[model samples]
Target: TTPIVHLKGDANTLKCLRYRFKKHCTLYTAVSSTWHWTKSAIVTLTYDSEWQRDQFLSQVKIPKTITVSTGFMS
Candidate 1:
């Protein structure tokens, strides 16, 4: 089952994503390409399954990565 990933970032970050995704559009599914800006700029990405999401999430570079003691955060 496909699930939507809602990503929110600032202007520069969003801009970076816009270009990055464009360069690797085949790597992801776009449920809603248009980003909605409110308090934060948000975009939704759809994946084929949880495993697909996990694979994509593994490649994401965030400031701080989180991991739980009992379970994996990624």
Candidate 2:
């Protein structure tokens, strides 16, 4: 995943990826991370799902640059 791209006429949104994978691997993890941009917090899905989607609601003006990362074990 990359940083949220702020474009014209478009509110701050994230690119979501949806995919399906078999349980071949022993484990997998998706951490819940958030990036502060335009005063809003962007979150990341921590668990693998059948489908994923991300959308933008409004403009977020981030006062300070901050990144939070949390991990979950399966």
Candidate 3:
């Protein structure tokens, strides 16, 4: 498979997911191509039960293609 950017913009909005799947998924990730921020400005996120129930959290600026492992593929 190849990485395809479905959308892009110049601002940050947690509600605006540029790429999406029709059904629920496993994991979500993000990568920047035409980088504008000294650090990665674009980000993708997840609202997993494991994360919430355990109160686990972390964020990184490394740019990479996002993937969903528990949805359409599995």
Identify the candidate with maximal TM-score. Answer: 1
Q: How well does each candidate superpose onto the true structure, as a TM-score?
A: 0.62, 0.22, 0.21
- What is the per-residue lDDT of model 2 for residues 1-74, given as tens digits with 9 covering 90 to 100? 33222222111333221121122122223423335465454554433432221212122232233333333334
Better of 1 and 3 by lDDT: 1
Model 1 misplaced regions, further than 4 Å: 63-74
Q: How does candidate 2 fare on TM-score? A: 0.22
Question: lDDT values of the candidates?
Answer: 0.55, 0.30, 0.30
Looking at candidate 1, the ten consecutive residues that score lowest on lDDT are 65-74
Better of 1 and 2 by lDDT: 1
Q: Model 1 RMSD to the real structure?
A: 6.4
Candidate 1: deviation at residue 17, Å? Answer: 1.6
Kindly provide the TM-score of model 3 when superposed on the true structure, using C-alpha atoms.
0.21
Error of 1 at 25 (Å): 3.2
Candidates 1 and 3 compared by TM-score, better number:
1
